[PDB]
Amino acid sequence: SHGLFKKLGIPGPTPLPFLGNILSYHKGFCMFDMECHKKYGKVWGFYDGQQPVLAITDPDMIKTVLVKECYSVFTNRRPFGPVGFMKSAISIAEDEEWKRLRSLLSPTFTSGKLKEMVPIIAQYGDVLVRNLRREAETGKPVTLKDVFGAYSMDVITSTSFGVNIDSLNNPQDPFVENTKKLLRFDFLDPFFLSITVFPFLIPILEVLNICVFPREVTNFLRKSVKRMKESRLEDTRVDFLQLMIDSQNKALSDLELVAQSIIFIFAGYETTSSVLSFIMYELATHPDVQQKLQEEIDAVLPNKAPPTYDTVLQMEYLDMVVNETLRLFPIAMRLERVCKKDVEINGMFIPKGVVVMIPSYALHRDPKYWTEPEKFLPERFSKKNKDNIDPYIYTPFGSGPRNCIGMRFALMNMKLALIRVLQNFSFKPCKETQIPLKLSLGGLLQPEKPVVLKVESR
Ligand SMILES: CCC[C@@H](CC[C@H](Cc1ccccc1)NC(=O)[C@@H](NC(=O)N(C)Cc1csc(C(C)C)n1)C(C)C)NC(=O)OCc1cncs1
Numbered sequence: 001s002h003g004l005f006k007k008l009g010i011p012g013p014t015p016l017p018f019l020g021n022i023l024s025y026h027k028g029f030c031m032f033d034m035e036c037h038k039k040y041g042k043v044w045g046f047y048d049g050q051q052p053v054l055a056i057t058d059p060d061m062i063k064t065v066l067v068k069e070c071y072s073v074f075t076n077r078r079p080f081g082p083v084g085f086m087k088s089a090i091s092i093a094e095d096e097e098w099k100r101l102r103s104l105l106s107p108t109f110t111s112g113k114l115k116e117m118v119p120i121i122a123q124y125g126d127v128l129v130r131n132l133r134r135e136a137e138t139g140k141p142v143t144l145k146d147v148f149g150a151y152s153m154d155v156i157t158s159t160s161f162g163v164n165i166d167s168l169n170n171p172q173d174p175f176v177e178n179t180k181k182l183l184r185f186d187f188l189d190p191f192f193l194s195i196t197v198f199p200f201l202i203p204i205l206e207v208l209n210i211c212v213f214p215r216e217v218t219n220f221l222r223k224s225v226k227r228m229k230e231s232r233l234e235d236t237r238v239d240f241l242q243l244m245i246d247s248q249n250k251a252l253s254d255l256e257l258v259a260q261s262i263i264f265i266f267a268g269y270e271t272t273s274s275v276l277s278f279i280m281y282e283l284a285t286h287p288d289v290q291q292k293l294q295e296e297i298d299a300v301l302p303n304k305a306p307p308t309y310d311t312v313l314q315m316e317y318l319d320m321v322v323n324e325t326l327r328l329f330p331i332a333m334r335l336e337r338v339c340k341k342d343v344e345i346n347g348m349f350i351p352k353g354v355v356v357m358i359p360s361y362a363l364h365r366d367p368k369y370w371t372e373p374e375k376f377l378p379e380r381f382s383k384k385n386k387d388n389i390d391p392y393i394y395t396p397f398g399s400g401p402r403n404c405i406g407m408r409f410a411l412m413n414m415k416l417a418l419i420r421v422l423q424n425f426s427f428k429p430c431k432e433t434q435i436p437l438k439l440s441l442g443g444l445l446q447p448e449k450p451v452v453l454k455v456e457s458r
């Protein structure tokens with residue numbers, strides 16, 4: 001079975017019985033992919049335990065699996081562990097169910113609805129600047145994840161559900177406290193290690209009602225959503241929560257609604273707050289880029305003018321800065337599609353069962369497509385070098401019918417935060433700042449030490 005790639009004539013490292021290549025993950029699965037790419041070329045194969053995985057790096061091959069063959073062969077992401085009713089969450093859902101969730105939820109983030117969100121978000125950007133000023137009035141080291149997390153939770157909850165939970169004025173906010181415990185995947189956790197390696201365990205666990213997400217956290221998020229939806233129905237603006245009630249009056253069940261809500265809560269909070277922290281980390285450590293960003297905001301928005309939808313969009317360098325951070329810190333380190341039948345794509349035979357894997361981290365740092373791939377140089381994303389960058393090599397939000405539904409939301413939300421912040425403050429590194437930033441070898445894209453900076457006024 002570990003002789004799949006040999007028989008197919010596909011290069012790749014040599015697997016150990018049972019574990020496969022899993023122990024090559026010890027120095028992070030990102031440096032695993034990079035090392036394999038450099039060594040094997042555009043295509044290689046490996047085994048997450050028994051699960052065979054095919055890694056692809058040729059752009060057209062990527063376009064085929066991501067776009068052309070989505071509905072026909074590559075509809076689904078890897079099955080990953082015991083998930084319970086969260087098996088209905090759009091990102092985890094398969095086939096027909098993903099299909100009907102995708103068109104139910106996709107109208108969430110249209111131009112019109114995105115434009116209506118600005119006033120709401122600008123309000124939380126004002127509380128954010130007020131909070132950062134306190135940390136600036138003292139010169140106290142600030143954990144970026146804390147402050148930007150509270151902001152992001154406030155934005156997603158308000159824009160998604162129409163509710164103010166005032167997380168920004170509330171240190172011990174149940175919403176933040178629970179959500180950051182929601183997923184804590186670790187290769188060092190025998191639980192996550194075991195199901196990562198030996199997937200035959202999973203169906204046993206689903207019976208036992210065991211789940212990758214902690215019970216206390218899903219219960220809390222379940223009753224919080226029950227509450228918020230009960231509110232909406234008792235009141236006498238169409239958002240994500242309203243759309244899902246419309247489909248209740250096939251055939252969306254209550255549990256399926258909470259699933260979608262937990263996904264949206266998690267992305268809004270965790271991904272948004274993380275990307276903001278990496279962006280600010282790179283500004284602090286690149287003082288002139290911070291300076292140059294500060295001057296666009298001034299040129300476009302003079303006399304501390306409030307950002308609007310179109311002012312955000314006119315801002316080229318702020319955009320350059322964000323793309324450059326996503327290039328260095330892609331939240332999804334790999335994109336994955338399960339191959340659900342035998343197919344030949346770009347004169348290459350892929351069998352049913354294999355996980356087709358696109359190593360975004362590696363491709364974002366390939367010396368082939370990027371000169372000085374390892375540094376922070378926003379210029380590489382200029383109006384001029386715009387059709388240099390291949391859309392299938394640079395995939396921070398993925399591609400095709402299963403790309404990020406919240407992409408323009410998160411881009412707008414982050415830029416609105418960045419604009420408010422940078423028109424008031426300056427971020428400098430301290431002794432408490434880890435330079436260079438090392439990433440955790442554990443799970444998601446997170447720093448090994450939390451991002452800690454000082455905040456100066458203007
Ligand atoms: C509530 C939490 C559920 C998780 C679980 C599904 C997810 C797949 C996914 C990732 C990114 C965007 C969309 C879907 N899984 C992961 O996040 C995993 N990480 C990955 O992204 N990988 C697939 C890479 C990876 C890490 S370990 C591994 C195997 C060796 C087991 N593969 C976790 C478990 C570490 N995802 C989720 O809900 O994502 C919502 C988002 C949308 N946009 C940004 S976040």
Ligand code: HEM
Pocket residue numbers: 090091092098102263264265267268271272275326330331332335336395396397398399400401402403404405406407409410
């Ligand atoms: C900077 C923040 C974010 C980054 C970097 C990001 C990135 C991604 C990536 C790379 C994918 C997978 C695409 C693929 O497989 O090709 C994805 C999936 C998804 N994302 Fe985003 N995301 C972000 C924030 C959000 C937000 C704010 C939401 C909405 C609240 C969101 C909702 C989704 C959903 C629902 C999916 C799965 C879509 C599907 O399977 O049909 N993410 N995210």
